Amino acid sequence: QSMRTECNTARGKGHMLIAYPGDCSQYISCDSNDQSPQQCASGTVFNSEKQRCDFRANVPSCKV
């Protein structure tokens, strides 16, 4: 309608696209072939160094 290509210098506010949710993690189910049951309970009784860090590629970080 009316040429408004002059005072269009206020078009620099397109940095508000952080609304993206966190429901895009449906690819962490590779455990089927990436089973990483990190349950190394290596706790030498001569150096109490229990490295039991449950890191199962199918379970949430359960470091023990």
UniProtKB/TrEMBL annotation:
The organism of origin for this protein: Dosidicus gigas
Domain Chitin-binding type-2 stretches: 4-64
Top-level taxonomic group: Eukaryota
Protein name: Chitin binding beak protein 3
Residues of the full protein shown: 163 to 223 of 225
